[PDB]
């Protein structure tokens, strides 16, 4: 990698990884180099297993959409897999919105549409992100008139595809009744993101992580007027149709885009 990219400042660090800014030799174009520490022994809990690195890389390879982070190049050395990624410098969407004194529902929906467009692309390729949250919703450049959303961090993303067992004769009840996680999980996350984007309030947050998890499982939220008095009924309906316990009864991404609140712009 160092033969081909000049490495600069550390930008941050996450799950067994350090991100540095870099510049490609010959072209001068800037990127983010994410150095992922490989797991050595399969018994270890340090680093990332090769198979999990591959899972993420295989998803990143396929992505070509303006609202998603792009993979440019990949290297591997003794200790690391280095992803050369699109440099996204505009920060978290919510930190940009914080510079404002207030935000209108129409200003918010400009951004929400971009998130939905990114997720529509991912879901069209059967990719569930599984960790949609405001910190993974960045901006390419926050100083332009109409900033562009970039979805980041495919660390737990999966392709969503019985036959592997040959027949079911020997399989346990938990396999018979296995209900896989799927694309609907992202649609729930979108509901929560929308809720907080519009109101500033987190719908399920409790005093401990355990309380939050309890609240989520019970679908225990409201639209209290202290937070929702300037929010439209169509916005509330959109959220209601996402925050559904049964994943099979939630709006899909296509239905989300066809919802009157979104169609209206």
């Amino acid at each position: 990698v160092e033969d081909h990219y000049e490495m600069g400042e550390e930008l941050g660090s996450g799950q067994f990884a350090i991100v540095r800014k870099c510049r490609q030799k010959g072209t001068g174009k800037e990127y983010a180099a994410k150095f992922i520490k490989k797991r050595r022994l399969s018994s270890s809990r340090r680093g990332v297993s090769r198979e999990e690195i591959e899972r993420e890389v295989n998803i990143l390879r396929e992505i070509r959409h303006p609202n998603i982070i792009t993979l440019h190049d990949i290297f591997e050395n003794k200790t690391d897999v280095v992803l050369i990624l699109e440099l996204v410098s505009g920060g978290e969407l919510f930190d940009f919105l914080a510079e404002k004194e207030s935000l209108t529902e129409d200003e918010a929906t400009q951004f929400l549409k971009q998130i939905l467009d990114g997720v529509h692309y991912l879901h069209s390729k059967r990719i569930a992100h599984f960790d949609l949250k405001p910190e993974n919703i960045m901006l390419l450049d926050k100083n332009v008139p109409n900033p562009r959303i970039k979805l980041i961090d495919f660390g737990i993303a999966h392709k969503i595809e019985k036959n592997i067992f040959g027949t079911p004769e020997f399989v346990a009840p938990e396999i018979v009744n296995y209900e896989p996680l799927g694309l609907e999980a992202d649609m729930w996350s979108i509901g929560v993101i929308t809720y907080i984007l519009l109101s500033g309030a987190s719908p399920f947050l409790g005093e401990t992580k355990q309380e939050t998890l309890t609240n989520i499982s019970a679908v225990n939220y409201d639209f209290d007027e202290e937070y929702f008095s300037n929010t439209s009924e169509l916005a509330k309906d959109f959220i209601r149709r996402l925050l559904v316990k049964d994943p099979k009864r939630r709006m899909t991404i296509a239905q989300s885009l066809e919802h009157s609140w979104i169609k209206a712009i």
Copy 2:
């Protein structure tokens, strides 16, 4: 290295998911092995070949394992089109075929083979590896032409390491993630119950007339011991089976408990 530079390749032995198995012999030692050639999926291909992720997952499992009752990985090569696993040659066929050839087979003899299965699984589970496909066709013998044949568990194509897992905020996670119950080592213990039931009786506990019936029967744990298939089976053996065919995975015998059970231990 290229595989042909180290191994003389021989005749074809079988086929797997986008795979061919050939007998081979190591140059420099004369020792025979099974070479499994797995076709890699191209980046432009949707369904042809096996994904790199799936090959790595299985290989990383195989690399870790060494135990007398599990197939051993000896070498790995990769060329343009394939990943090639050089595996221990397991020549003795299916356990159940060998047993079906015996004039008679006592419960004591059956338990001794079953113990070898348990020993292999005990090792796998000690590494947090669930096999997930334990069934007769994956229980082979190394060499059937010896007084006491050695069981070899094969086919780690759906095996997985087993690890509420959320390091950051849980605020945006869906209820199905909050309530997610992953498949675990207990699933293998269920399979061992079914294997044992068939081993002793020749009947299958949950098999229905259609796939849906089999599924329904498993989920309901709807089985019994027919009087005229279990007439020569001990209550102690039935107890072993009963403690494995339990709906709640948390209430099934673990591999350690299975080995401590008096059917095995006595």
